[PDB]
Nucleic acid binder design. Structure first.
Length: 77
DNA sequence: TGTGTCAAGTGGCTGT
DNA sequence: ACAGCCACTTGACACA
């Protein structure tokens, strides 16, 4: 047999409260790169699961750089 | 009506 | 073998 499995999974935009954001911003705006017992603790404060921290921290370090592609321009033939 | 945005989803080589 | 962000992209979400 081969296919994977019966899965049909569902990510609706799984948004953290501006507060939770703020602490995520906070922890980004301070720090690029977190060991779990730091970051879980943010996950603890704002009461998310630590990947939901991490993943908001992943989404920022690429997001920055792109912004900066703007600044000058997206100069590509 | 359609898309960007956001968060994942997903996928890719790098080193010990 | 080993661990997995980084960058693209879809998969739900705001908006003219």
């Amino acid at each position: 047999a081969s296919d994977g499995l019966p899965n049909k999974k569902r990510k609706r935009r799984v948004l953290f409260t501006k507060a939770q954001t703020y602490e995520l911003e906070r922890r980004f705006r301070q720090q690029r790169y977190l060991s779990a017992p730091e970051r879980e603790h943010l996950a603890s404060l704002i009461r998310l699961t630590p990947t939901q921290v991490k993943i908001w921290f992943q989404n920022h370090r690429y997001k920055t750089k792109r912004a900066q592609n703007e600044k000058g321009y997206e100069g590509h033939p």
